[PDB]
Design a binder for these strands. Structure first.
Lengths: 93, 78, 97, 105, 103, 95, 80, 97
DNA sequence: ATCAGAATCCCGGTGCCGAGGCCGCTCAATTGGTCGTAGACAGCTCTAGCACCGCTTAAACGCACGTACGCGCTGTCCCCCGCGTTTTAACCGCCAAGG
DNA sequence: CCTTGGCGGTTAAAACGCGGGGGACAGCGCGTACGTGCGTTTAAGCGGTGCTAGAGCTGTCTACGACCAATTGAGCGGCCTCGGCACCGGGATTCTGAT
């Protein structure tokens, strides 16, 4: 069947993380599951924040505050910075 | 300040919890654990309030934070 | 006259076991909550029900912590509880990282 | 830059994230800025794991990354451990730990 | 109402409408909310019977949250279901270690 | 002045049915109303997850059946299944 | 028969060594097998309920994954 | 060629197993145990290999974690040997029954 | 062992304020009709879960042997508890912006 | 309209000092059960070999659930009375405390 994966995306990230560090398939699947769980949890927190504040839309602010809630202090701040930078350069472009 | 959690208060809590005799060095660790638990819960509550751009934190937000911590409270608009 | 140690403590255990009132003083706890939330956000208005729920939750948390502390102390053939008992209980509970 | 990821300068697909968010039933409507933020967060988290995984593989003087290295990277870092203490990595093993009392003198 | 016609008490219509508002599914079946209402009714009936027994233990007529606390903490399955949740103004069960009692 | 909806009167009727003479306090009533809300949330979320795992969108009574069997512990789940199945049959018998 | 006893004493010893136990009593194995039994019971009960809800009679890996996710023992790399 | 003081083999095997990342229990007994313990839920159930693998991983992880907890409980009382009472204490603190 | 002596639950008398009962009012539950598609069901494919057999050797297991903790006993020290005593600020109650 | 700030009374409670014996430490005195090696038996693991039941994919016709418009009554806002637990004083056993 036609099954999706984040394999090429993680590969592209790995190329710019370490050009000379390969990965096994089992680790690739573990990373795929990790990405799926993180997406599910962040989107769930955003959905809870939207339903709890009477908003039927999910925007950058909900994702940002969900990231702040989930990730620890330093990691939450850096992830928020990365997301805000990406959103700003997407809006500019 | 932080001394409001007194020795008789911790002693009463320990008596209610079933502890018979308590050493004199328990109180500081109990205070520290209370401080960190309050930091976590109130951090979640203030983040919930700030997402709504409000300034008055509600008991509803506190209950939501406790739900996030896995220690839900009933009777407070849950 | 004088009562032997550990008897009036057991009577207080009995009395505190039936009461359900909040054992923490109100205004000191309000001040603690304000001084612990000041560092996060500035000029924070607090609801009475909010700090009351905080009081109840913290009281239940401390009661459970003291139960685990007494259990840890008695598991090692000891009556008095030591801070190491709290440390071990919280480490096993998964709160300590 | 035609793909929303290219405009956002992101490796993770903005379009795929948007499609999953829409067909995930999280809300009635999904803003266009949310998928970019979510893709950026996912990319940053995957990277933050990847650098530590590469260092763990380097320490084990092995060319490739094994899930043991992933478990090592998750366990050693305090924040990653705080995040994924409720996750067990397949064939990850345990950290080398010996209690001081158990050590012979 | 659908509730009385189904031999139940809790509102089927309110349950279905709040199921809609929760976005729990794109479309919701007709018989699922009826079963949900029945399960909620049975759970509430068991909790209320236990609370009444606890009140009868203390020779009391009005339900105090302490009675609910004791009822939850005495029954096994309900305590398992609601163990991670603490109850305001409830207290804990009377338990003193057999080692702490005097000779 | 918005309207706040609750389950107070319904639980009061249930208590009167299961107890001819039993008073109920506002705090206990609120605690059990929030408890009913929590059970509603738990069952709804479990049903949604079960429907998504089978790639469906229509949550029938069967999804609620399996959600109750997974959530409620053992005998509670069996009693809930029996009562709810009887209620569903009663509802389907009439309009 | 008695396939729980198929988890022999050396296996429990090796698991304890992996955990980092220095001295092991002779009767630890029974309690270890009992805890293994109860964890297996709850996990497989959840997985079998999930599989039956799907109207299939083949215990799949994703069923165990979702059962563990409910139980708070989420696993990665097996799908989901 | 010689027998040394007991305990050194324990240190060596603990270090090797911690450095190891394998599954300690044999596959066939575990699969038979899974079949036996699932026969009481639904008969004629056909078990995927990946299901048995996931069950083995989860079981070994849970048992190992219980083993660090039991070791911590044993060393809590200034002791090295582990007793079942440590096992019930660890499970009680964990909140699992 | 057995007497002295405070502590506290049961009993009786106070009592007051939220719960139970009721009433008035309104918007969401109920009913009929429509149509669009999610899926229930019939049906073919071919995948892998399973059963069996033969080597084959790694792994478990019974047993002798030894000493390293486990547990107990005895002593020594000390430090929370319980008593009384002194201070003190929290709670009740009242009263006002004001955002 | 709910949160915050100010003020006055007081008493219930928090904070202090000190005698003391029960509990927390240590340091032996042994007892044995687990740690370890040595065979010896066994069963798990691997390599084929079928075997076949059931998961999976495909299409089709349906019948139930998301939409519309009437309609009406049962649940929420608002109001009033009582008894049942909040509270206070007496009585007698139930424990401990002492010898």
């Amino acid at each position: 069947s036609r099954k999706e994966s984040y394999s090429i995306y993680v590969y592209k990230v790995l190329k710019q993380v370490h050009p000379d560090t390969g990965i096994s398939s089992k680790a690739m699947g573990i990373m795929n599951s990790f990405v799926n769980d993180i997406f599910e949890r962040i989107a769930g927190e955003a959905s809870r924040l939207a339903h709890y504040n009477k908003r039927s839309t999910i925007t950058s602010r909900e994702i940002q505050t969900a990231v702040r809630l989930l990730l620890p202090g330093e990691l939450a701040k850096h992830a928020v910075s990365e997301g805000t930078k990406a959103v700003t350069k997407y809006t500019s472009a | 300040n932080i001394q409001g959690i007194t020795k008789p208060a911790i002693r009463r809590l320990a008596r209610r919890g079933g502890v018979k005799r308590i050493s004199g060095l328990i109180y500081e660790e109990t205070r520290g654990v209370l401080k960190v638990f309050l930091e976590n819960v109130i951090r979640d509550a203030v983040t919930y309030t700030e997402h709504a751009k409000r300034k008055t934190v509600t008991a509803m937000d506190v209950v939501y934070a406790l739900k996030r911590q896995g220690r839900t409270l009933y009777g407070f608009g849950g | 006259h004088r009562y032997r140690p550990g008897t009036v403590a057991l009577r207080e255990i009995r009395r505190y076991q039936k009461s359900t009132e909040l054992l923490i003083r109100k205004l000191p706890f309000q001040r603690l909550v304000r001084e612990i939330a000041q560092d996060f956000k500035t000029d924070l208005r607090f609801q009475s029900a909010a700090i009351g729920a905080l009081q109840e939750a913290s009281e239940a948390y401390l009661v459970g912590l003291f139960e685990d502390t007494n259990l840890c102390a008695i598991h090692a053939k000891r009556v008095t509880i030591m801070p190491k008992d709290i440390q071990l209980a919280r480490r096993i509970r998964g709160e300590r990282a | 830059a035609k793909t929303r990821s290219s405009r956002a300068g992101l490796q993770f697909p903005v379009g795929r994230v948007h499609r999953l968010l829409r067909k995930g039933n999280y809300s009635e409507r999904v803003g266009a800025g949310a998928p970019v933020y979510l893709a950026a967060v996912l990319e940053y988290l995957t990277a933050e794991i990847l650098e530590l995984a590469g260092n763990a593989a380097r320490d084990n003087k092995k060319t490739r990354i094994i899930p043991r290295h992933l478990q090592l990277a998750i366990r050693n870092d305090e924040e990653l451990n705080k995040l994924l203490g409720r996750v067990t990595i397949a064939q990850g093993g345990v950290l080398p730990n010996i209690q001081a009392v158990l050590l012979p003198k």
